[PDB]
Amino acid sequence: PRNDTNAKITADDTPLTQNTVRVRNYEISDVQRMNLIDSSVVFTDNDR
Amino acid sequence: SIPFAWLDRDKVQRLTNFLSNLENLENVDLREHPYVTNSCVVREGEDVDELKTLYNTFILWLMYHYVLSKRKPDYNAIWQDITKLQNVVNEYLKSKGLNKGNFENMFTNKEKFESQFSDIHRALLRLGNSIRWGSNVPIDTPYVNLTAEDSSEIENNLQDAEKNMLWYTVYNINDPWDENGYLVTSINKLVYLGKLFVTLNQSWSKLEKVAMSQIVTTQNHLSGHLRKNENFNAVYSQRVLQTPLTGQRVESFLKIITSDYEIIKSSLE
Amino acid sequence: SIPFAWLDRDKVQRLTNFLSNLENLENVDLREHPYVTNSCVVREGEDVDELKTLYNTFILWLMYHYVLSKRKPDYNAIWQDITKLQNVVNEYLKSKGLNKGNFENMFTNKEKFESQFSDIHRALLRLGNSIRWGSNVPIDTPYVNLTAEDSSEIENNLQDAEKNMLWYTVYNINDPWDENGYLVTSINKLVYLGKLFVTLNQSWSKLEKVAMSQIVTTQNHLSGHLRKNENFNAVYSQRVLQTPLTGQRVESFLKIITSDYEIIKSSLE
Amino acid sequence: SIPFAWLDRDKVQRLTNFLSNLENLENVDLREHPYVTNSCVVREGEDVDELKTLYNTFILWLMYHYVLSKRKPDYNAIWQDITKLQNVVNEYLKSKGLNKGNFENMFTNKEKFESQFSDIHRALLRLGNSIRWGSNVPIDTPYVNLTAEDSSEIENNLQDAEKNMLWYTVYNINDPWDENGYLVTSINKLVYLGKLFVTLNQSWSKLEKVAMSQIVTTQNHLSGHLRKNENFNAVYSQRVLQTPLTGQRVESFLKIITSDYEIIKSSLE
Amino acid sequence: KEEEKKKQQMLTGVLGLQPTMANHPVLGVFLPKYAKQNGGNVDKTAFRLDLIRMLALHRLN
């Protein structure tokens, strides 16, 4: 969601900001994001 | 390892040397100096040059924006001293004891626009106050008053800030000679540091918008030439090179395009 | 002329190149390179080696310790920025924003207390999270900056310093949108420089302690081997090589055995 | 004219160079420098050594104690400033205001007597009073003055002085601008100068007792080894080498053994 | 010779794909990149999904 710097969005103790989140890459299809659909790491499209 | 196009061993070493020592030379503008862009070329006429040097300049502008975003120094370091002078001296003089003005007017002209002030009229109010403390009436010299031994040198400092916003120095106005003491030295440092802050921020925004405009410009001309062929490696290079870029995403895309330079050197026609 | 007992010119070139590029190669630790010790071996097999590899390694450990104590870089240049960020910002934000001047950085006062840094870093995690958000909720981030794209880079840099404390580089911060404006210096960079500084000191004392322990062990073995012969220059070499060595004695003793190399090569059996 | 044993001119020039530039290099001790002790040794086997290097080490310790006793700087100049601070400031403030510790004023007046070794121990309480003057509600401050750079370089300077008693530097505590009060900065003056004075005297007395103990040891070895011979030159060298030595006696003994050198060299076999 | 066993082991770990599918271009290009991974603790499922989405990207008529 928009303007996250007001709030504190969490899924672990880590807050999910622009910087904590790795951007989703739809073409290269990294293996790390495939591991982290099982794990608890949030991923964004950078479109906002 | 420092990815580039079909280049020689002299051009890669020279571009590595330039983008490493981007901080030491003055007038950092890549649009301004043409010794890099025209020379990062395969030669070979224009026929084999076009599509490959398009990718070469794409990597050059992209890595230029990367090293800018990595080598920016913090300007909040100078705005913290702006806040220290403006809060701790000038409010205590203008509102406390001497009180040559209104609490609301002076306090809110200092307090308003903590983030993103570009106002010259607030400065001009402090200039009129300082010159009223000074000898004369008019505002011919904005900054330091009573003395022009430092005026062209402070303008040289601001031009050097405009040239190299990555490496900047504070003038630190001289102690023994003064129009008056603590007050106009505080006002003087406040005006000079505010001008330095807005100068460095405008120069950074200029170079960031320039670099992003050049990268987005080269993406379209790259995609138009690469769109036509139908091999899998070709269309995968098309998708990798059509992934959208922002200045805050360019670092991750630089890592991605290294790991895809593993293939797309061979995917060129 | 870096005198070695009985080696090939190739082996002398190997050991001279090792002690020359000690600061350049990674993983600076003499146990980590077996081919240095394998290069240190003497010709003609075990009958020659059982007497002469002891003296050869007794030269080589001393020279490793000598180039180790000579090529120490000063770690006050990195503590200077710790004190600068600490004293200038971490005091003054507390004094301004009414944190009653919690002195906790001043319990150490020095580079002498290599303990309590972890308690200071946990307190700084609480401070940085309180300044970034009002919620407080003490969280389990390693770094206040919330940067996960460069935390791997920071841990990479710390492992690089662990491998080569002789040659170190210092990382920095990026500013498109700042979590903390200028506070990011004295809470993020203070944690990074504190971890880097205590890492360099611990790895330094670790390597120096290992070098001194191996020098003492080679003293004991080589004296126990050379005890048997009662000849004149033999027990002269016993009295020369029986001398106890500190890290304060070691450079002068290198000069002693440099002088003694001409007589001792004949003197050994 | 500083004659010695059967050494070469290079080794004699090494000993003369060390004893001339003793004050220049750091950590002035023979157990710091085996290069003096092992440049002391004579060639041609160990029988020459067991007869003659005992005599030469005896000569080294005599002349080393001589150049110590000739080159000791007098520390009562800094004790004069200690007495000025203790007499002038502390007595006036404690007897004047908060006049309940007049018995501790008489205690530091007894500390003015030359018994400062026991007195520097548990001095801290009169820094504990200055805690309150430096900062209100006196919780705790470090073992030295409040300033971090000053405390670190005071510890550095004390280590430098303890290494080299012969060459010491005053720190020059003072500051133009002080959060601290002038009187508690004079307290910091007194604390640092007292530590420097007691450190220099204790390290001097340590090396002086080391030199005297080594001289007595080498006397016992020389007399036990030259006991066996019955010649007139032998018993004359026995008496000259048997005369007992205090530190006041060592200079006249050096002048006496200078004159007796020509007959005891022949008396050694 | 040295590098072939790892590629084939990862090929059988992904799905148990047949060599006939190993000859496919999407496989022929990505098996070397999947070689420089899966030696780590990453996953086996991630590689299946990656092959899925890449094979899908390949077939856009």
**DSSP secondary structure string for all residues of C109-128:** -SS---SSHHHHHHHHHHHH
**How many CA atoms, within 13 angstroms, populate the side-chain half-sphere of residue C219?**
17
Interface of E with A (CB under 8 A): 34, 37-38, 42-43, 45-47, 49-50, 53-54, 57
Contact assessment for residue C192 and residue C121, using Cβ atoms and an 8 Å cutoff: no
The residue type at A39: S
Contact assessment for residue B19 and residue B2, using Cβ atoms and an 8 Å cutoff: no
Question: Which residue pairs, CB below 8 angstroms and at least 24 apart, start in B115-122?
Answer: B117/B194, B117/B198, B118/B198
E59 vs B: CB within 8 A: no
C-alpha distances (whole Å) from B192 to each of B131, B151, D110 are 15, 11, 59
Closest-CA residue of chain C to A7: C133
Contact assessment for residue D4 and residue D12, using Cβ atoms and an 8 Å cutoff: yes
Contact assessment for residue C239 and residue D40, using Cβ atoms and an 8 Å cutoff: no
Contact assessment for residue B243 and residue B58, using Cβ atoms and an 8 Å cutoff: no
Find the helix or strand (DSSP H, E) in which B224 lies: helix B182-226
Whole-number Å distance between alpha carbons of D171 and C139: 45
SS3 assignment, position E28? helix
Whole-number Å distance between alpha carbons of B23 and B19: 8
Neighbour-count burial of C236, counting CB atoms closer than 10 A to its CB (0-12 exposed, 13-18 middle, 19+ buried): buried
Contact assessment for residue D93 and residue D183, using Cβ atoms and an 8 Å cutoff: yes
- What distance in Å separates residue E19's CA from the closest CA in chain A? 23
Q: Which residues of A touch E42 (CB under 8 A)?
A: 31-32, 35
Q: What experiment produced this structure?
A: cryo-EM
Residue A44's DSSP bridge partners are A23
**What residues have CB less than 8 Å from D125, skipping those under 6 apart?**
D104
Whole-number Å distance between alpha carbons of B47 and B67: 31
C-alpha distances (whole Å) from B210 to each of B31, B163, B257, C3 are 9, 15, 21, 61
C34 Ramachandran zone, left/alpha/beta (phi>0; psi -120 to 50): alpha
Stated resolution in angstroms: 9.0
Q: Which residues of B touch E37 (CB under 8 A)?
A: none
Locus of tokens 């580089």: C169
Among B191, B221, B190, B233, which Cα is nearest to B85's?
B190
Interface of C with D (CB under 8 A): 83, 87, 106, 109-112, 232-233, 235-236, 239-240, 243, 245, 248-249, 252-253, 255-256, 259
Whole-number Å distance between alpha carbons of C200 and C114: 11
**What residues have CB less than 8 Å from C168, skipping those under 6 apart?**
C73, C160, C161, C196, C200
Buried b (16+ CB within 10 A) or exposed e, D215-247: beebbeebeeebeeeeeeebeebbebbeeebee
DSSP state of A10: B
Report CB contact under 8 Å: C135, A8.
Answer: yes
Phi, psi of E18 (to 5 degrees): -85, 150
Contact assessment for residue B167 and residue B196, using Cβ atoms and an 8 Å cutoff: no
Residues in chain E: 61
